[PDB]
Amino acid sequence: SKTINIRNANNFIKACLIRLYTKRGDSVLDLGCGKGGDLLKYERAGIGEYYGVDIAEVSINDARVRARNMKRRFKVFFRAQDSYGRHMDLGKEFDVISSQFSFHYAFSTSESLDIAQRNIARHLRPGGYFIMTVPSRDVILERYKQGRMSNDFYKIELEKMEDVPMESVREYRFTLLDSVNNCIEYFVDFTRMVDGFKRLGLSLVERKGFIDFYEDEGRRNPELSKKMGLGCLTREESEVVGIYEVVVFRKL
Fold first, then answer.
1. Which fold is adopted by the domain 1-252?
2. Which residue ranges make up the annotated binding site for S-adenosyl-L-methionine?
3. Angle (deg, nearest 10), helices 210-219 and 4-21
């Protein structure tokens, strides 16, 4: 009830991102689909096939029920496993691979990231797109210097001192009202991600902050914005949304 606006904003951004890189008849692989919250969004996109994967079986169960009781024109596939730290081979390519608020979990270890990046590359068709939404390390670190790492909606905690630079930290504690609690998150090493993908045939094509993406797409989508309680975000709410950024890679 209190994070309603924050949720609406994030869902709107995800709906626009999907709409921007998806087309009718597209096959989509949803990594970290969670409770399948984007199933309805893809239904509007007119996709033909949806494949959801998540490490938490408890979330896959909710997604299965959601797809089983919703009006969809596309087929659905679900599988509970780790598509980041463990080899994955679904035996099929997809036009679009989505990873919303979860890809940063692939930066657990150097090997984990390499496995994750390779799983995406082998499941993405030539010319396909890889859309993701993850926290911005630059934004987070900038707030650390400002001394403002939280409000009444969220809270981020970094590491200690003792010869440990700000560029040394690789993880942090993230808390969100009515959401995760003291959840360990790994910083996204953009450069390493881009370089890794580049060697796998994937090049960067998009990178914009949530706020800017939200404002620009908002003026270009009055209907999709009015079709919900969407509207104006407050400073405190904007602080949470301004933490994430949109990143898109394409296989060439």
1. Rossmann fold (3.40.50)
2. 14, 32, 54, 82, 100, 105
3. 70
